[model samples]
Target: DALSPEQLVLTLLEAEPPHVLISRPASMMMSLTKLADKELVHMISWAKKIPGFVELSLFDQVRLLESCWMEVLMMGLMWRSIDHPGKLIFAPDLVLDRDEGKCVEGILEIFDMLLATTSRFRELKLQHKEYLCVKAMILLNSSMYPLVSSRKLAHLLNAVTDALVWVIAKSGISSQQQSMRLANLLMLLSHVRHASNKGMEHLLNMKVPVYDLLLEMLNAH
Candidate 1:
């Protein structure tokens, strides 16, 4: 009767948005970012501890983590920014430098976890390609643009988009799954775009192309 590791991870991922975005007590959002890092670290630890979690083929484990890293990082940034918004800019260097290396280190470590996941995916058989492709796109898109801009991040976004388009054209995902994942991406994109454009009109002007692409993708869906 026990849940599979994949099921447990998927259930947790599906539950998070509602818990964090909709149903969580309003009091929690008022103090939203507080203790975010500790909470995230704890959750990741819990995932790693799930019975048989350690035994998952590395790819499966990464797939599980890929499904959740964005939410984890967003919460961390929310807390850190709330504590010191003036200092912690979204760029990777700034994120690392401003917070005595915590933000940078944590973000990079998550990315490292993702890389492990990606490697596992590449090793899979051809039949597993579609899901892994979509999963990689999701992971890359979330990490590269979490409320910041950089040449590197832009490149990352482009790569993820390419993979997504290819997957859709070749694999043709379920409409329900496509809609669900696209909606999640839009929500996360809004968070990053809104935060970046705040009091930074110059940067906003520069981002028109990225914003345009995002709009196009959403509208196309």
Candidate 2:
């Protein structure tokens, strides 16, 4: 039997890459681009393999990825942050400074917001399961983008949201606490979308050479 949605989400989060290596600006760009490409491929494959996601149409699957890839990338980046200040662990050795991102215009601003969001995640002490649920919610969301099957996507979103609530309830917190945490997690979605949009703006407008795969993905949708 396939894993339940809850189990599947937890499994994927646990299996995520913990870190990567870093180097100079030029090399870092190449490495991060490759890393992002790998992440994108894994996410697409994982979505197809997961039970509920496999039920979605190919159109929805691509739309979901188009709408939510940056948000998922940011969530992964937040999880990789170290316990120190002023740096985000992009990989094991690839610590990123807010101002160190080159090539993209407005990257510094995006990094600043991303770092703040990372701090917020740390303060919330979000669990792997919670992050996974939130990522699902973000992917299933259809409100921001035009979709051929908004009704189906909305149903999927509600299912994911309910699953997340169930996960929180199982944590044994007070009802009020559970409500608060759920609210906090949902609020983070807006920040993730904002950061994602900012990054997209840079990707669409910047002249620097981006990874061919990433550029293709962006242009495809």
Candidate 3:
């Protein structure tokens, strides 16, 4: 009856968004850059703690972290705003009420995508177990399927898939609607995946400070 890996992942993932204030496009860019550095620090430490993560070669570890940075961050970001409805908690110090996000030119698209995803997360009443599996699977994804060369990808993802199903079934939405929730929950990943690739594409316009770690991650995907 043990759910050890999910339980283990849960411990490292006890997280909330952080913050800072912002006004102009210039200031928002800086605040976001600062926040990205801080969040990446936490994410680096957290990913290393994933079960068997360190066992991978250092290059793959870096590949895993760098590649999935957007997806993982998107997941965490949506998780932060799921409760607030129509708002974004960009960092512990930064909160964006719905209208304020529109001031940024390209990011409004990014914002709406994030907003829609969080709304879905809110609707799904996403459980931590489901979140854990999806995050792990996303990291394992290595930028969608065409590049997925490793059989470990399928093997690893399958384990998490079963976990998600059981988690959904136990929601006890009467077995029939159990798959209903599963259908919807699995669907969240498409947008999480969509938003991540698109979000990073949009974010490329705002230059982050050129620290090596940030540089390394930014260049990867």
Candidate 4:
């Protein structure tokens, strides 16, 4: 039997976390390289599971992945520790302080904002479905870059957004509360997008060795 979109989202959410250590600049960079390579592989496989993604032109598919991978990665990170504060928990074995993040050039600024965003999500008490739906919203974004068929991408976006609203409506909340919740979820996308861009810039500017797979993935477009 085919899995419903919601089921797929839940399954993806349950997948393993991409772990890394960020104790010092050198160690953090090396760990990040490994993490990125692992994440790229996972994301690429996950993309194939998204409805309509496999049907996209190869160029458009690659373009979308290139543009959105960082945001998606950050979303996963946010979901992992939405309630945790003060530091990032990359994995059970790896964590880093804000000051330690400063050891890597450009990371401190981005990590600070990421921490803030994590707090916002935590404050909202985002449910699992909400997080998964918003992640679908991020992945289906067609406005990020030129695509062979932006209209198709836009259709997918609308489908995902409608699904999210439908899920919210079915939660038995009052109409007003439902509207507020939906608005809040949408607004968080702006923060996610900003953090994603900052992450890309930091990765580009950092003077450290990046895993070849990750480097190629970054420069693919």
lDDT of 3 by residue, 38-67 (tens): 677667666666665555556666767777
Ranking by TM-score: 4, 3, 2, 1
Task: Report how far off residue 207 is in candidate 3 (Å).
Answer: 5.7
Error of 4 at 206 (Å): 2.0
> Which residue runs of candidate 1 sit more than 4 Å off their true CA positions?
1-10, 13-34, 46-140, 144-190, 193-221
What alpha-carbon RMSD in Å does predicted model 1 have with respect to the real structure?
17.9
lDDT of all predictions: 0.37, 0.69, 0.69, 0.73
- Candidate 3 regions exceeding 4 Å error are 1-25, 144-149, 210-212, 215-221
Location of the lowest summed lDDT over 10 successive residues in candidate 1: 17-26
Each prediction's TM-score against the native? Answer: 0.24, 0.79, 0.80, 0.83
How good is model 3 by TM-score?
A: 0.80
What TM-score number comes out for model 2? 0.79
Clashes in predicted model 2: 2
Error of 1 at 23 (Å): 22
Per residue, candidate 2 scores C-alpha lDDT tens digits across 54-134 of 566666677677667777777778767725456777766577777686554567788888888888888888887887777
Residue pairs clashing, model 4: none
Residue-wise C-alpha lDDT for candidate 1, range 134-179, written one tens digit per residue: 3333334443324252443344445445444444444466877666
Which candidate number has the best TM-score?
Answer: 4
